[PDB]
Design a binder for this molecule. Structure first.
Ligand SMILES: *CC(=O)Nc1ccc(NC(=O)C*)cc1
Lengths: 15, 358
């Protein structure tokens, strides 16, 4: 749901 | 259509290792891995209590792999490089792996203080560090032991090992708690052991006034070597804890032998040599008290006979009976400039002894 955005948020700042 | 940790772990556990091994990972595997944890840490009863132990066990199994890959070399050099490769990768995964478990760490309850990363940084300390710690130092010291002898090496091997003792300590109160008791402690013992069988020999081989040019030059080379291999970033007084070790191992451990030559250097007026002794005994606690005493007694006994030849000759000519002590004082008021640059401690004894000629 919104966890897609917390995953999408973590993918960016890490990579 | 339901699912448990038992059904989903076998799809997650690959992605854990790919992140632990720093292997490339796809965008879809990131989202699958959050989406699996969102599902197990909820619909599963003891689900969060199972990703917690499964992830302890899998982290530990990788760190046992890394230990075997490091211990795979017998060259105490390529083994240092291998340890830092695996750690630098590791340390760099501690900022990455704890992210897909954002819900685990909440279901079990940001920035550095996470349970997973604390589990990763610990397990590396519980395991590969604690087991290789003594080899890690019994190898890095040989590269400096060799540096002191001619062998040029990659000085980043012992630096990289240093800044790896700094980063593994998670203590917020004592950040250098596994550096001050492991890296620093071995670098003091090896430096010590080195100058117990290398410096007593320069005193058997060459003389004493030769050893003073040696202990000197070895406090200068062990200092610029400590301002590389030891900690300078955050203030800790480690480089200065080495020079105390060194002074004790070069100058203090041979003070009596150095101070024996004091009296004659004064008599023969060896100022370049008394300045060198000064340079050495001034790093020693109360080391120049005998030095002071050798200039205080000699000044006296010199101005005790270089003045008796007066009452049997010059007694009515104070114009001569006072000038010899204008020159006598000058013999010693000029030795102090050339030798001790008019240090106030040697003027006190220059005067403490000249009041006795009065
Ligand atoms: C739920 C959520 O927003 N998690 C999140 C967002 C951003 C970051 N930033 C980085 O990783 C650099 C972490 C976690």
């Amino acid at each position: 749901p919104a966890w897609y955005d917390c995953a999408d948020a973590a993918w960016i700042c890490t990579f | 259509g339901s699912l448990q940790f038992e059904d989903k772990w076998d799809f997650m556990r690959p992605i854990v290792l790919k992140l632990l091994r720093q292997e490339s990972v796809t965008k879809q595997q990131w989202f699958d891995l959050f989406s699996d944890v969102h599902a197990v840490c909820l619909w599963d009863d003891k689900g969060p209590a199972k990703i917690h132990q499964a992830l302890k066990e899998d982290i530990l199994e990788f760190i046992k792999q890394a230990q075997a890959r490091v211990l795979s070399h017998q060259d105490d050099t390529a083994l240092l490089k291998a340890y830092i490769v695996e750690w630098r990768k590791f340390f760099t995964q501690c900022d990455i792996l704890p992210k897909p478990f954002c819900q685990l760490e909440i279901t079990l309850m940001n920035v550095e203080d996470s349970i997973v990363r604390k589990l990763m940084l610990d397990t590396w300390n519980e395991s590969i560090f604690s087991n290789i710690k003594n080899r890690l130092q019994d190898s890095a010291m040989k590269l400096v032991h060799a540096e002191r002898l001619g062998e040029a090496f990659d000085s980043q091997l012992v630096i990289g090992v240093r800044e790896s003792y700094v980063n593994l300590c998670s203590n917020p109160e004592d950040k250098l708690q596994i550096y001050r008791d492991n890296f620093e402690k071995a670098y003091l013992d090896s430096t010590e052991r080195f100058y117990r069988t290398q410096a007593p020999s320069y005193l058997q081989q060459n003389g004493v006034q030769n050893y003073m040019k040696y202990a000197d030059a070895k406090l200068k080379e062990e200092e610029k070597r400590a301002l590389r291999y030891l900690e300078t970033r955050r203030e800790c007084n480690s480089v200065e804890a080495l020079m105390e070790c060194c002074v004790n191992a070069l100058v203090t451990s041979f003070k009596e032998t150095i101070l024996a030559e004091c009296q004659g250097m004064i008599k023969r007026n060896e100022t370049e040599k008394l300045h060198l002794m000064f340079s050495l005994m001034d790093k020693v606690p109360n080391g120049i008290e005998p030095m002071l005493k050798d200039l205080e007694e000699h000044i006296i006994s010199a101005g005790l006979a270089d003045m008796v030849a007066a009452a049997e000759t010059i007694t009515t000519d104070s114009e001569k009976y006072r000038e010899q002590l204008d020159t006598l004082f000058n013999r010693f008021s000029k030795l102090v400039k050339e030798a001790f640059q008019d240090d106030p401690r040697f003027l006190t004894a220059r005067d403490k002894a000249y009041k006795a000629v009065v």
